[PDB]
Each structure stands twice: as structure tokens, then as C-alpha cells.
From Swiss-Prot, chain A:
Impact upon substituting L6H: In sporadic cancers; somatic mutation
Residues included from the entire protein: 326 to 356 of 393
Outcome reported for the amino acid change (mutating D28H): In a sporadic cancer; somatic mutation
Effect of F4L: In a sporadic cancer; somatic mutation
Name of the protein in question: Cellular tumor antigen p53
Effect of E25D: In a sporadic cancer; somatic mutation
Consequence recorded when altering L6P: In a sporadic cancer; somatic mutation
Encoding gene (name): TP53
Mutagenesis or variant effect for G10W: In a sporadic cancer; somatic mutation
Protein modification: Deacetylation by SIRT2 impairs its ability to induce transcription activation in a AKT-dependent manner. Lactylation by AARS1 prevents ability to undergo liquid-liquid phase separation (LLPS), thereby inhibiting transcription factor activity.
Cross-link (Glycyl lysine isopeptide (Lys-Gly) (interchain with G-Cter in ubiquitin)), chain numbering: K27
Effect listed in the UniProt record for changing R13H: In LFS; germline mutation and in sporadic cancers; somatic mutation; impaired ability to tetramerize and undergo liquid-liquid phase separation
Effect ascribed to mutating R11H: In a sporadic cancer; somatic mutation
Physiological role: Multifunctional transcription factor that induces cell cycle arrest, DNA repair or apoptosis upon binding to its target DNA sequence. Acts as a tumor suppressor in many tumor types; induces growth arrest or apoptosis depending on the physiological circumstances and cell type. Negatively regulates cell division by controlling expression of a set of genes required for this process. One of the activated genes is an inhibitor of cyclin-dependent kinases. Apoptosis induction seems to be mediated either by stimulation of BAX and FAS antigen expression, or by repression of Bcl-2 expression.
């Protein structure tokens, strides 16, 4: 478990990265 | 706004060519006229070049001219949402399924692009499973076309847009024949395009005849305007489109993957001097 931050330019690009990142985290966070 | 907006600043000549096949009835339609995007205006005359049209003219309107939606008028603050002009000059592919309730289905594929100074819409149409005595093959539809609102949404996976709307064809018996439209547009070129937030196109049409025209034909005047997003919302979009956002990533490899894609994207912008970033 180690956190990192990424600077994303603009709403459109950020919403795309955040959506993919959230989908990934909803597989490790289901108790696994 | 896109670089392609400059191509629609004046009157643009339009050519439409359709090859169709409905239940084996083959036909071809040619249309020519002008589009005036500044006023959301297009004027076209269509000709059936193979004899009598085997389907009613109103059933082809959306394929022929909601086939050149790059002539829609986007209000100034909504021009950041105009996918259609952004794909020009290279153009876009427009695909539809049109499902007539209790009757057949149209499937269409079109290329809309500039060829020289002319905007050209070339269409292939396949119609299957129509009732030989139905409202379409039986020519039971009135020669009119009501106003519609075409719902447009972004399709980022394919770098394009989708649209869904239901057309209400008046039948001569007084009832209505529904035409369920499913639409996909994708750019032909590999250059950057505008992907819109949710909005709709408000369309208006009047159908007429040319008294001097001997062939089976349709005359069309159409006004189309984008709508649905306020000026205040687009000012927000414009601000947010320029800001930096911090994304928090869990895991070194997952971070490394996001970072390389982010760096690639910022590299694309910088190589094009940023000319396409957060375009109004």
C-alpha cells in the first residue's frame, strides 16, 4: 500500500483518468 | 471552438448520394443544394434517379439530412460541443439503425466529408423485414415531417458521439408510425475532435415539391439549432477545462501506467503547440 499523486490538465482528461482509476480500486477494495 | 469551424462560416455547396435496397427494391437518390451553418440552414432538392422511390420520402429525411448535422447552428458558448465541424475537412462516418415499429428496419452507413469545396454525404442503406402492404412499402405516410429534438452524447471510447431520437411519421389513417433512431458518429481522420457534453439538436423541416421537376423528388428546407446547456454552465466548463486536477493513485505500477499515458497526452498537446487544448 503506497500512494502517489498525478497532476492532470483539464476536466475532460481528469474525469477519464479518475473513472479508470476508480474502476481499478473497486476490485482491490472488495476485501481483496 | 474547433479549427473546422472556419469551413462553415459561409455558404457551402452540398452533394448527397444514396444507394438503397429495401426488401430487394433497389434505388438511388441524388441531392444537391446549400448549407448555411451560421443560421442552422440547409436547402436541398433530392431526386430518385432509378425511377419511383420504393419507400416514402419522409422515411429518408434523417438519412439524407440529419445526415449532414455539421450544418447545425451551435450558439457561441456551445461551440465547444460541436463534434461535427471538428471532424472536418477529413470528416466522419455516420451509422444508424432505424427501427420502424411493427415493420422493417433501416441500417445506414454514410461518409460526410469535404471533397474540394463541396460537403459530400455518401450513404449506403439496407432495409429488411418490411411488410409488403405496410405503411412504408405501401406508401401510407403523409408527406410532412414534424420537429424533433436529437439527443447527443459523447462516445469517448470511439472518440465520437452517439444520438438517439424517435421520429413520429404521420400515417394517412390519422395514426403515427414510429421510427426509432440509433446513431453513431466517428471521425475519419486521426486528428483531434471535440467531444461534447450532453445536449440536443432542435430541428425543423418543411417538405415541398418542385413544380418543374418530372422525376420522383423531394424539396427540403431545414433549420437546426443546438441547445440544452446554459451560458453559465459553459463558462464553468471553460474554467474547469483549463485547471489542473490532482489524482491520487494506489500502487507504484498503477501510478507508473497512469503517468506514462498522462505524459503521452501532454506530449501530443505540446507537439501541436497546445493549439487544440481546451478549445472554445
Amino acid at each position: 500500500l503506497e500512494y502517489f499523486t498525478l497532476q492532470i490538465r483539464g476536466r475532460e482528461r481528469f474525469e477519464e483518468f479518475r473513472e479508470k482509476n476508480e474502476a481499478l480500486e473497486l476490485k482491490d477494495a472488495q476485501a481483496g | 471552438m474547433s479549427k473546422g469551424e472556419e469551413l462553415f462560416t459561409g455558404v457551402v455547396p452540398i452533394l448527397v448520394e444514396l444507394d438503397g435496397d429495401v426488401n430487394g427494391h433497389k434505388f438511388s437518390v441524388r441531392g444537391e443544394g446549400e448549407g448555411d451553418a451560421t443560421n442552422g440552414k440547409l436547402t436541398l432538392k433530392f431526386i430518385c434517379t432509378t425511377g419511383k422511390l420504393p419507400v416514402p420520402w419522409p422515411t429518408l429525411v434523417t438519412t439524407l439530412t440529419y445526415g449532414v448535422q455539421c450544418f447545425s447552428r451551435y450558439p457561441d458558448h456551445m461551440k465547444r460541443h460541436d463534434f461535427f465541424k471538428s471532424a472536418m475537412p477529413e470528416g466522419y462516418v455516420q451509422e444508424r439503425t432505424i427501427s420502424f415499429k411493427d415493420d422493417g428496419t433501416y441500417k445506414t452507413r454514410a461518409e460526410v466529408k469535404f471533397e474540394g469545396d463541396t460537403l459530400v454525404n455518401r450513404i449506403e442503406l439496407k432495409g429488411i423485414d418490411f411488410k409488403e402492404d405496410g405503411n412504408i412499402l405501401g406508401h401510407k405516410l403523409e408527406y410532412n415531417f414534424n420537429s424533433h429534438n436529437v439527443y447527443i452524447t459523447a462516445d469517448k471510447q470511439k472518440n465520437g458521439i452517439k444520438a438517439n431520437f424517435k421520429i413520429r411519421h404521420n400515417v394517412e389513417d390519422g395514426s403515427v408510425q414510429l421510427a426509432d433512431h440509433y446513431q453513431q458518429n466517428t471521425p475519419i481522420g486521426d486528428g483531434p475532435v471535440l467531444l461534447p457534453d450532453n445536449h440536443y439538436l432542435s430541428t425543423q423541416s418543411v417538405l415541398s415539391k418542385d413544380p418543374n421537376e418530372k422525376r420522383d423528388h423531394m424539396v427540403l428546407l431545414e433549420f437546426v439549432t443546438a441547445a440544452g446547456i446554459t451560458h453559465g454552465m459553459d463558462e464553468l466548463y471553460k474554467k474547469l477545462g483549463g485547471e489542473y486536477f490532482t489524482l491520487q493513485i494506489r500502487g507504484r505500477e498503477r501510478f507508473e501506467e497512469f503517468r506514462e499515458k498522462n505524459e503521452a497526452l501532454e506530449l501530443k498537446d505540446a507537439q501541436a503547440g497546445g493549439t487544440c487544448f481546451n478549445a472554445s
